[PDB]
Amino acid sequence: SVFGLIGDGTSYSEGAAYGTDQADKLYSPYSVYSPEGEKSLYKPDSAEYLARKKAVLAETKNRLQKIPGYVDKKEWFNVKDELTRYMYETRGAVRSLSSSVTQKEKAEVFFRALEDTYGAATLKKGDAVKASNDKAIAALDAFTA
Amino acid sequence: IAGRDIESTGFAWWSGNARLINVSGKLLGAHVAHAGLMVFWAGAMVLFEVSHFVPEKPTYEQGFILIQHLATLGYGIGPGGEITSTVPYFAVGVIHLISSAILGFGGIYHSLLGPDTLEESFPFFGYDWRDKNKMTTILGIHLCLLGLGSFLLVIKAMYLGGVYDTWAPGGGDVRYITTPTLNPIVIFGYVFRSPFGGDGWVVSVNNMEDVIGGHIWVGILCIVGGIWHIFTKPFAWARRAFVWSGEAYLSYSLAAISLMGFTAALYSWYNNTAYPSELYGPTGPEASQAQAFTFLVRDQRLGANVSSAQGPTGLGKYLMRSPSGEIIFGGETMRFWDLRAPWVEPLRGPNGLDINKIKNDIQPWQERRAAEYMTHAPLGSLNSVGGVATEINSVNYVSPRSWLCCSHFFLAFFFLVGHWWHAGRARAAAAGFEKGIDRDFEPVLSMTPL
Amino acid sequence: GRVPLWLVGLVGGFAVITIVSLFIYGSYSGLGSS
Amino acid sequence: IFTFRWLAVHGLAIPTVFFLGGITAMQFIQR
Amino acid sequence: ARFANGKPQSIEAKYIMRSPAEWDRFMRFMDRYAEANGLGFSSXXXXXXX
Amino acid sequence: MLTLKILVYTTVIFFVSLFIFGFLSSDPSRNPNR
Amino acid sequence: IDLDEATRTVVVDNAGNTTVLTPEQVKRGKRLFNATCGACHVGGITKTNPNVGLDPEALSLATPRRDNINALVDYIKNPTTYDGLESIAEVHPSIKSADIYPRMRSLTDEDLYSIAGHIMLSPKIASEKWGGGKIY
Amino acid sequence: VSLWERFCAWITSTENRLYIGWFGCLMFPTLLTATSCFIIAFIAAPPVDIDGIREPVSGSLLYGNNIISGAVVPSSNAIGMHFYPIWEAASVDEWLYNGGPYQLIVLHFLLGVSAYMGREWELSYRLGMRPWIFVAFSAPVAAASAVFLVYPIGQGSFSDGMPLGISGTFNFMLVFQAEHNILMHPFHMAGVAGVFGGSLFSAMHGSLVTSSLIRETTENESTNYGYKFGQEEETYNIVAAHGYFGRLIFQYASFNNSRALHFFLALWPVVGIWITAMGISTMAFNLNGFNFNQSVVDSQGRVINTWADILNRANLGIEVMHERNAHNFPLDL
Amino acid sequence: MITALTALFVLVSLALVVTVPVALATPGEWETSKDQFNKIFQLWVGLVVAIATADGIST
Amino acid sequence: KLPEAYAFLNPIVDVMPVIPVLFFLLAFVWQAAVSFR
Amino acid sequence: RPFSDIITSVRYWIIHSITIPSLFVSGWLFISTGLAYDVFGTPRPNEYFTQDRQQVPLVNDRFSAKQELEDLTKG
Ligand code: CLA
Ligand code: CLA
Ligand SMILES: CC1=C(/C=C/C(C)=C/C=C/C(C)=C/C=C/C=C(C)/C=C/C=C(C)/C=C/C2=C(C)CCCC2(C)C)C(C)(C)CCC1
Ligand SMILES: CC1=C(/C=C/C(C)=C/C=C/C(C)=C/C=C/C=C(C)/C=C/C=C(C)/C=C/C2=C(C)CCCC2(C)C)C(C)(C)CCC1
Ligand code: OEX
Ligand SMILES: [Cl-]
Ligand SMILES: [Fe+2]
Secondary structure, three states: OOOOOOOOOOOOOOOOOOOOOOOOOOOOOOOOOOOOOOOOOOOOOOOOHHHHHHHHHHHHHHHHOOHHHHHHOOOOHHHHHHHHHOOHHHHHHHHHHOOOHHHHHHHHHHHHHHHHHHHHHHHOOHHHHHHHHHHHHHHHHOOOO | OOOOOOOOOOOOOOOHHHHHOOOHHHHHHHHHHHHHHHHHHHHHHHHHHHHOOOOOOOHHHOOOOOHHHHHHOOOOEOHHHOEOOOHHHHHHHHHHHHHHHHHHHHHHHHHHOOOOOHHHHOOOOOOOOOOHHHHHHHHHHHHHHHHHHHHHHHHHHHHOOOEEEOOOOOOOEEEOOOOOOOOHHHHHHHHOOOOOEOOOOOOOOOOHHHHHHHHHHHHHHHHHHHHHHHHOOOOHHHHOOOOOOHHHHHHHHHHHHHHHHHHHHHHHHHOOOOOOHHHHOOOHHHHHHHHHHHHHHHHHHOOOOOOOOOOOOOOOOOEEEOOOOOEEEOHHHHHHOOOOOOOOHHHEEOOEEOHHHHHOOOOHHHHHHHHHHHHOOOOOEOOOOOOOOOOOOOOOOOOHHHHHHHHHHHHHHHHHHHHHHHHHHHHHHHHOOOOOOOOOOOHHHHOOOO | OOOOHHHHHHHHHHHHHHHHHHHHHHHHOOOOOO | OOOHHHHHHHHHHHHHHHHHHHHHHHHHOOO | OOOOOOOOOOOHHHHHHHHHHHHHHHHHHHHHOOOOOOOOOOOOOOOOOO | OHHHHHHHHHHHHHHHHHHHHHHOOOOOOOOOOO | OOOOOHHHEEEOOOOOOEEEOOHHHHHHHHHHHHHHHHHHHHHHOOOOOOOOOOOHHHHHOOOOOOOOHHHHHHHHHOOEOOOOOOEOHHHOOOOOOOOOOHHHHOOOHHHHHHHHHHHHHHHHHOOOOOOOOOOO | OOHHHHHHHHHOOOOOOOOOHHHHHHHHHHHHHHHHHHHHHHHHOOOEOOOOOOOOEOOOHHHOOOOOOOEEOOOOOOOOOEOOOHHHOOOHHHHHHOOHHHHHHHHHHHHHHHHHHHHHHHHHHHOOOOOOHHHHHHHHHHHHHHHHHHHHHHHOOHHHOOOEEHHHHHHHHHHHHHHHOOOOOHHHHHHHHHHHHHHHHHHHHHHHHHHOEOOOOOOOOOHHHHOOOOOOOOOEOHHHHHHHHHHHOOOOOOOOOHHHHHHHHHHHHHHHHHHHHHHHHHHHOOOEOOOOOOOOEOOOOOEOOOHHHHHHHHHHHHHOOOOOOOOOOOOOO | OHHHHHHHHHHHHHHHHHHHHHHHHOOOHHHHOHHHHHHHHHHHHHHHHHHHHHHHHOO | OOOOOOOOOHHHHHHHHHHHHHHHHHHHHHHHHOOOO | OOHHHHHOOHHHHOOOOOOHHHHHHHHHHHHHOOHHHHHHOOOOOOOOOOOOOOOOOOOOOOOOHHHHHHHHOOO
């Protein structure tokens, strides 16, 4: 008793039917295969995460001005670790904050500078690392816009 | 029907494809049609995964197996491994489907209406299985094609939008590999190093520069070899150790491809560089290291002095010393001390796991990554229950690394078996006693007793 | 010998494939599916 | 017509079809 | 141990001595096989000609 | 213990080269029929 | 025995008011909880931090009380420590950390209400295994 | 006549008491050193720490063991997957403390069995017979490789390989059940079916052949003495055996082409063992068997136990006890 | 339009696949009916190009 | 999810990947049609 | 008579298209109407526990098993 033909000859069930792919009424299952809905409730795209992103950028600055001190001494692991441990949120933050074409292009320039810094630090060339850090500083403090 | 019957051929219906050994046109048709089948599966599966895609979950939780490759190539992926759009995957799928239709038509035409033997009408595509010059010519042509493909990958990574790099500064993202490593010593160090723990014969490639350089080298080698085999003829030393027949060539290919399948299976299980953990999920050792790391952080929050608490065996339950002296996580995960992950490297110094960085400079994103990886370990069941074998079934997840590794290991061994079978049969048939003994020239009766 | 053997073989194969498929669909929707 | 075969065959086949019908109905009977 | 390593030669002595065994074999093999350029049999795995 | 490594590296290359050059010495010709 | 009216009544607020979850709600919850919560909170236990469990007894001893639907929903809106001294939204899934965790970028109120209802209701059904662990 | 030629000839000779061949050049020294080290270690190997927790386990006869409890304990967990030859240790005593002999013996044994397969094929070629016995021998070789090499590779440590002993084998099997659920894996089912069917078919074939034996002996003389080595006619009557087999089960159901019968005899256990080795290999990468835990639920939601849940209970009992001191964190990853 | 355009493409591809394998086999059938098959091939590629042009424009 | 244009054609994609397996079988059914000649 | 000849016979399928589906439908209705629960005494999904007992209903006696089961299977 209590049948359950592929949601077509019976009913829902406090737990048994699965063919459903619907039968919920709540609203739109994004796709017939997703319990979740679309991005139209609760979380808003740009509530106050922009303040957190700006704070991340400021502390990214604060992290990046201590790199020349670490390259003055012959320490290379510290440069890579510093450039990757807290800058991790900075890539996404800078990408999301940028909205105009100039911001996009020069954020790309900043990413180029950081990648050059990483490569030169791996290759252990002090001059290239220092120049790349200077260029990264210029791009980043010219980003605050 | 002359060629299609156990009488005319001598081959039963179940071993029916062996009737095409000496038929050139139909064999070409079969090969082309099979390639069309491969392309069709690729396109269809890409479209299937794009249809069933859900933007909330990461790709390694959706049971996806192909979106990860195209994402690693740098298609529709943002910083941190977030998927932006799924349009390029749809484009790849539809292009593959159309090309598969074309290839299937070609295979059908060549199998049904095409001339049975290409030697008579097209004395450029005809072969004999016995002359070496034409065999080496075909081998060289396809070798040049493979070299061009390797070049194409290098070109894509260097000047066509770049590829996804986990070890990139600021997190994983798409970048251009401007300066690949071209030093032959460093490139062939992978090829000629040990396959044991701590070495990782070709699986232990770390950065993208090594990947690009190795591909440049492979393309150059393949181009040179393809040119060389086309022009030259097999030498004397190789002319008397090889069996020159179609089945022998098939057996050689089977052995080589079984080795390649084993390598790919073990390569998907250990590598983080070409298999980013943000797309395929954490590896075996990565989950264990993540568990140790997250429990270390949790116990440190309470105020316990990490790196001073003796374990139950007196060995140290948070920080240990590796048999080489490096400082590593304690517990059973000391076997995985060779691990190098993008979210754990910031904490590593020249001496190993730095302690001052752990005590002070810890990051919340590392905590989140470690918790997510511990909660998603490459553990599961055949019905995809997920978790440990004794766990109840509420989650539904099996890591794609496990699927890839298991499936390809199975296929690789069975192709090794195919190599054994076909090599034995090819050599016996070339010798001339693959059907029986003789009953009048039995070699055992002509040999000294013992 | 009116109906060819492979026709009834194909019909039986379709029937058995159907029945077995109904079994897995069930391992998934109903009792025993959790 | 009813040879031993017919018998044994039918005694093995009738319950088989009955049970298969029963088992299929079950696959729907959903809690 | 885990020090990568081209092959596993760590000391020039080890390479220079894994050398004479292979070269000894090459010499004993060359003793039979020398001054061979042609004699193409053109048959399925025949190599009948010595 | 470097001496022990040297001796084992010899034995191994010894036997491996024996194998490689034994199978290179026109093995397919070695056979009941000719 | 069925999932009757008596067993579908759960506490809705600190006072003690008790609302009733419609069967649809139950289903949606069990689904949403297994999809999002399940990976770490399977069986009513916390996998990463086993001390802070999910069983009703531990929720009753949290600060503030977390043994009703409203406090669970607020906790999802704004998660705090066990004693409630500070917020841990940066290290725990929440609506506040929707940017950090993309899973909640789509969750709605009813969704939260159903998830909280499932968390409240499951210990009324199992009654000894919700948060029990291997032993049970 | 050169020297190389003369050698090559002696090597590939088919008149030597035991065939050497080119694969023998790899099989003989390797198997000989493996067996020498195994025999010495089974008698006088000092205790070895296997879990890398400084808790050595004795496995030698001279350390209060018997034949069943004795074993060659696998290498330490601290080493993991790292290569540990003799010359990498600072002393032989230390090499013995970390279980190097296990690695030595297992690597040599694997190379030896591979060369054994090759040598089987080589002799088949020399004697002018059809070359597929080594394909049949591949199944035990695949199983041994999966249990000794592939599983440690997947798990990440040589300490997870099967110890060379009786009680060690039982311990390995029990821990495998606890951590992986081997019984509920369809490939283990296929292997059990293959082994049981192999025994069944062996017994039945032997009974059918021996029962129908042409009367060529008295009663006071072994029935086996009727057959003479190098006969030209079949000593058994296929017709009578097939008549008995057909009358026993069914007429249609019966093999006549004795060649097909023997091919089926070879096919069944070999494919069974191949599938089993694939089960072990797949489960080395944590693709466990079916988990039907709490699958049956009543209307309310309470769980109704099945026979699988008692299996899970036994697995929990084994799991919470294995390697009692090795674990520090809740999950076994 | 795209949705429809493709629908057609699917229908014409089905009609082509059900009839090409039967043609080639049936001895002779091919040649005699070659030009209609060529025309349908041109229709097929035209439909594909039309679908691609739709998308592009519509994005 | 597929682009909005092809969400209507989704059900065909739901079955497309399993096609090849059937090709295999076709071989067997084709051999059965010709009496496993 | 060999099996294949019977299988391909038309007069066979004219007596195997009014017998087999009817038997299948009867087997379906055997449990669709819920008779099988009563015939074999197996509990329905809503009869595992009752309001009075919330544990497994085990039999403890041997010669009074009938009454014990009758009581347990009250509700
Ligand atoms: C990828 C798998 C594959 C491929 C490419 C082939 C290919 C071939 N096989 Mg074959 N075979 C296979 C698997 C395969 N086989 C398997 C698994 C078995 C075991 C059962 C066999 C057993 C077998 C035997 C016993 C024989 C062959 C033969 C042949 C050759 C001639 C076939 C023929 O005349 O068809 C005739 C069949 C048909 C005309 C009916 C099939 C109709 C079409 C082709 C089906 C596909 C239509 C497709 C879906 C439509 C797409 C259209 C496109 C425009 C989109 C041909 C090269 C024969 C041979 O040796 O040739 C000399 C032969 O005697 N095969
Ligand atoms: C590229 C790889 C490749 C190629 C081109 C060939 C080619 C050939 N093989 Mg071969 N083989 C291979 C790999 C390959 N093999 C491997 C890896 C193995 C090890 C298992 C073998 C083992 C093997 C044997 C033992 C024999 C051949 C034979 C042959 C010849 C005839 C085969 C034939 O007619 O197929 C016919 C194809 C079939 C009958 C299909 C059978 C289907 C299999 C049994 C099941 C597949 C299961 C699949 C994975 C999933 C099933 C799904 C299902 C649940 C729905 C032909 C030259 C025969 C020979 O000697 O010819 C001279 C022969 O006796 N092969
Ligand atoms: C010889 C032979 C054989 C083989 C054959 C082959 C192998 C074939 C192949 C074939 C093929 C391989 C085919 C393919 C086809 C394809 C197609 C036909 C496609 C189509 C497509 C479409 C139609 C699409 C559409 C769409 C779009 C555009 C968009 C999105 C949606 C969709 C997807 C819908 C066999 C074994 C049988 C048998 C013996 C003989
Ligand atoms: C891409 C890449 C890479 C790679 C590269 C390379 C460059 C590679 C190569 C590779 C190679 C380079 C390989 C090779 C191999 C080889 C082999 C595998 C061989 C084999 C041999 C044989 C098999 C032989 C046999 C024999 C004998 C032994 C005796 C006599 C007879 C005969 C001849 C048969 C890397 C990793 C870096 C990184 C990533 C990317
Ligand atoms: O070592 Mn032998 O048994 Ca493979 O899981 Mn983890 O580790 Mn230990 O525990 Mn469970
Ligand atoms: Cl641990
Ligand atoms: Fe026998």
